[PDB]
Symmetry: D3
């Protein structure tokens, strides 16, 4: 197995690129301090918004956007290389397409300083969020101790289909980085557990400590076992390092060995006792509709919130904010 | 609103058609007594295996199988008409195709005594259960108090895609009837909550009190709100009637009005704020595979349990256990 | 003893006087139904904003304000006389001084239909609430079963000095009516307990089920014993009636008999065992300051929120929002 | 921020001045052992009665009384200087006025070995306690990491007015030392939380492990955040060191920045939206009465426990015990 | 099944035979009211000291002692016959041997008004209680719904051997009536569970609401299943009626059918699988000693409390306290 | 006091003597790693089945059986000597009598490498277990920090008479080693607490992490105080080391000093206030029957499970498995 660490990082108010640089250096010191304090740690996870903070007046400006990769990711890579750990980082990424809004991005860097996974938030916390819908799917990569890692961001964790997709591609440790998991805290705890159980995989999840120079007790850290049991739940303190031992091969072995608990197999092989191989047609219209690009809820023509003019967003198209 | 009752029904050991008829009369008496005790109740729900019990040496025999509809469902129909309630019942159903095993079936009968929903368990609990995988999809019907009801059976409730399917078809009250959910108890409670939250719908779930003539404290009754909160959690007693008031239109209104919480809408309309209208393709390979009937986990090759041979079931198909 | 009921009343969105009259009829129907359902009940308590709702765009308009007493309170009076109960009601009250904003008012009406207590919210919830600070002090009246009742409103319950004041005037059952206490939920539960314990009195507290036509699971009902123990904690359901038996004389007897636990006596008689009779001056500067109208925190100079300007309220005084 | 430590100190039976000296040396070793084990600790807190034990047959004798300052406090000071920590100590203090009973005293010593705060219990746990009512008010001092410290003793923590007084004078970390917080344990936990929330400050509280050479599991350690959440609650073990990180400036910033949660400001500025500056008259009779030295409860002429002859104390005056 | 009720009865301070007669009438009224309120109830249980209270200055006087049977038990008998219930009552019983102290006695009266069980407290709560150790063993009687009832009193329930004895004689519902179990509350709850589990029987336990004219929230009501699970745990209210359905035959069936769980059988038949029939001698020295009347703890020589001298009781034997 | 450690040891599938040797070496490394990580630890406890695993196809074979003492115990002794700790080990012991089935054995080894306690499971978890009923009684030995140690195995902990026997012989720290304490987990937690309280002693209890190369989250570690409070409850992780400080002399002092709580003394001295010395006859038939070898339950002639032919065991006699 391996030791994982989820950092309840407190980000101060960010007003300039100068503040962004100090923030990056704070993350780096924290990474090193964590390896020093926990000599066995192999994976260190930082929360959503931890690089550039949460300044909604500036976060679409060019000063506030970074490239992935870029000079800042190289600094993170250098840190991961020196500390010899896998690290997970949150970056609001300048869209290579200058016409489009930036992405909300997560990267995993390995102990060699290589970016081995790049994920762009697939379901931007709408209507509040300006981030462009991610186009890299749900990737999975090799991690420490036999792990296959995947990451989702904030609201993404509320979508069980995304956890399934990760697992379907081999993920056995599903990471969630968040930056507003209070006031809907119960549902965050709930889905971290269900994402684990549904797919027989570990979940490791972290929330930002805070962002406003005042309150820094919004942080969360949760590790769930592949049976959905919460193995570790951090107390909520700024700078809290939530740690636990993970055994990816145990999740693998449960997937290989289990019968009654093997729901992920059952999904595509229902009733395999009565019908050799199981029924491969799950019998679900929404799956077929979603595959065909025609998912439509029966009540869609009667909805209220469907565009972001309740705070201020152009939803016809174009580019805005910069 | 409407008042729902979930019955923690105890079934004796079932050795004969005589015992099955006894269960039927006992269920009917319980139905009437519940209506008498709770004059406002509009929906009364009985657990999986409450009609025929769980005699695994006999459960595939003709003596132990019923037709749906048949004389027995007509008895249940008569009871629902007399009490003027909706009732949910479990029947192991003779397969009209004599080359296939029986189904594990649930019905909802209305206060007119008409069967308004027939559901055949899509995900038999394997490798222990020999039931043929269901072929009626996940139907939804009109229920009391503005509800759109759907029923799943036991193990079905572990599959989040199935809860999504019910919701997709309009369900705002998702019923789960269970027979031996204990020892998977934590995961049963968990998924009852996540099924509700993921889909912004109520869940109402019940487990059989027991089945072995000895222990009858396996019963469960759980009502979850559309935010995933457990509203009512039954005490575990044989014959316990777990009740709660349900407001289906409140769930409907959440679905029409909520933004960030509206995960079910977001699934099919990714980022309507940044992308015009939102993207309708996340790039989920498993959805495309499942839709196409080719869902295949990367590790299927090394799995230990892919038929019923561990329980001595034949592995080649056809009707068995007669 | 006497039986108390706290009603988790749901209020629709209120757009008109028509809707207000609807709430009034709904409250009256609920009052009668509660008496019918609980024939022994002697005190029925409705939440803050249950009469007029929480339309912040309209709540300061003449259409949305009532007189106390007026035709509407006479309707409530008639209901209490008919049901033979004490009732607690919330009314946003037109200020007779046209140069001042309306009050946030609570009344208790007796089983004779007489208003026996009128309280104007001493601590409006700022900066969001525009209500004029109350000018009737913290009154106490005779209630059922040997009780001396007092009512505070919402935010008022966060001020321990106010609970002390009610006790000081004889209160042994302290009622708190609330309208949007959620998100301050932990602190609401906490202070309901501390208000009871600090003063050796019961507390009975209720929160509105909801107010926005969508979510009605914000309701709370809490009854605390005079030792601070929560005796009854409601489930959160719209329309839930939270009930409990209260024994006011037991609190009186604790106040007369207890030694170490008698903190309320000790406050004004410090050390009667060492000093003859006890010292009546602890040297509490804030008490002397507050009494003199000069309470001033050392950090007031640097405070960010000291008027309603954040919500766009005028800062110079007088009547606004008409 | 800074690390605090609350020591669940077990005191053996104390029969002589010789025992008192051994006890002092035990406290000192514990202080040093704590700094060694927790290199970052800046504040180490010892419980009530930890210096002289709890021998109610001898505790009024001259052999058992110490001066503050005196040779024993100099030993504590020397320890705090060598370890470079702030320390909090409990001393039963000989009254400089030989006519009067001794005080129950707490001191805070800084890393320079200076006594920077001296507090005498204001509300002696009557009727059991012989200690003279304190005459030093509720002082506040500068502590580590931007803290302003204040201390109360045992029953004092049950009086919210004392927590308010500390806060009013700038306290942002309120310390409570106790020596009998079992059997009324719930109320201790409760008030540590409410004292924190009511005033937007941290509370750090400790109870003596035991005193009778037999049972040493009465110890408690509790750290509460300024929102009233218990951040750390020790398990109850003798010698248990309960630690946590405290961020005084965060409490300060909440006091500066918050609106809805700013109850301490509201107390003296009620309804400041409707009335510029708020109403400075809180409308509370007991505050005015207490300021004028005429606090009188309505039921005072009917009370039982008002003097300490239920165990044995002369309440007319004079000196006794020595 | 049968429905049981445990009454959290409050007793006033008892100063006279007049007060005792008052308690008797109050108990009888409560018995009838319980039957009226719960028409299905077949067993109604009152706490220890509910007849005579807990006046320790008077409790050994002739005025405070009753005969069993006597005129007072005949009153209780009449009530049980009229209500057609089984009732459990507590009576401090005059010892027919004038050279011995009175007994602490419990009776069960049947729906015919016959005393069918008389039990004298085997383990008086020492050193506080002066009752003569009981001499009727642990009797068992036929109760409602296939039950075999046994009663123990207060402190008795702390002795697992006594619960074993009741079971050994056939008991499947073990009743415990208590008078001041608080402050031993955790251990009372604990042993109610272990007594059930150890012996595969239900336990039904009640504690007096209070006894001192001031505090009446000491009441407890607890029903445990034969697996040790708490089925019902009362709220603490004076007059609270704690009810639950009990299925004695289910316990009987567990005892007949269970293997690994059948600890009560295993105790007397060690290893029937390896040794033919099982060994009937574990080599338990304390059992042999206790049987022989020579149970002696290795440390008895150094024990501090072995008589009632701490409470001022005489230590030489005979009748006292008259 | 002293520090104890309970090791949630994960044992892999064991197929040969070669696997047994690797397992022994794993235990030894774990012992050393534990002393290194916890320099103050004096007692390190390994769970049932940790030496030879749980291979029910091979565990009766000569290859799988060890002698006590033997070369393997000498390796454990050498480890305990080098690490200077007391260790507790589980060994399936070859019966010196070749006619009889092997024993399920636990040993305690001291810091000198001497086996100071040897216990053979007295009540073999029947009917599943082949182990011969133990013949060494319930021994007690001197341990670290003033402790008197005793051990029981798995199901033995469900028998309160065995805990009593240990205590009766001086035990003040009662150890339980288990290897299947899930699915009856509640009852394990329950009895660890009751065994402690009933006898005024500490309990320290551990369960095997797992055994099947798949699932290793069955582990448990629980330390209970002599009042029955759980002081430490481990999270369930493979390799988890559950530690706590134990103070045996405190248990001793409670046994010497306590009155109301002294149930272990009361057992053999009931009602000692009324009757000098107490009544030495406990009044219990089962105690006398058990001492005389004639323990017989009233329902014994109607039982089902009484021999192990439900899995496959010759219960007439002889030798089988090898």
């Amino acid at each position: 197995g391996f030791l994982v660490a989820a950092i309840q990082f407190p980000v101060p108010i960010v007003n300039s690129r100068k503040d962004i640089d100090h923030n990056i250096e704070s993350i780096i010191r924290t990474l090193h301090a964590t390896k020093a304090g926990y000599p066995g740690v192999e994976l260190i996870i930082f929360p959503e918004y931890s690089t550039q903070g949460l300044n909604t007046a500036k976060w679409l400006s060019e000063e506030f956007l970074l490239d992935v990769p870029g000079k800042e990711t190289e600094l993170y890579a250098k840190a991961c290389k020196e500390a010899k750990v896998y690290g997970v980082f949150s970056i609001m990424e300048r869209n290579p397409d200058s016409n489009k809004n930036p992405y909300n991005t997560a990267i995993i860097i390995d102990p060699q300083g290589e970016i081995i996974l790049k994920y762009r938030k697939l379901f931007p916390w709408n209507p509040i969020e300006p981030w462009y819908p991610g186009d890299l799917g749900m990737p999975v990569c090799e991690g420490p101790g036999g792990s296959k890692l995947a990451v989702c961001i904030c609201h993404d964790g509320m979508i069980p289909e995304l956890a399934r997709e990760a697992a379907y591609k081999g993920c056995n440790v599903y990471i969630r980085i968040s930056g507003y998991s209070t006031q809907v805290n119960d549902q965050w705890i709930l889905t971290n557990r269900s994402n684990a159980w549904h797919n027989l995989m570990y979940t490791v999840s972290v929330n930002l400590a805070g962002y406003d120079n005042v309150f820094y007790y919004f942080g969360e850290g949760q590790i769930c076992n592949f049976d959905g049991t919460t193995l570790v739940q951090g107390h909520r303190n700024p700078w809290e390092i939530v740690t636990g031992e993970i055994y990816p091969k145990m999740a693998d072995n449960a997937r290989l060995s289990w019968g009654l608990e093997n729901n992920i197999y059952n999904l595509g092989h229902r009733g395999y006792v009565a019908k050799p191989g199981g029924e491969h047609d799950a019998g679900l219209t929404y799956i077929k509709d979603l595959a065909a690009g025609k998912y439509k809820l029966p009540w869609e023509d009667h909805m209220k919130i469907k565009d972001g003019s309740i705070y201020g967003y152009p939803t016809t198209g174009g580019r805005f904010g910069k």
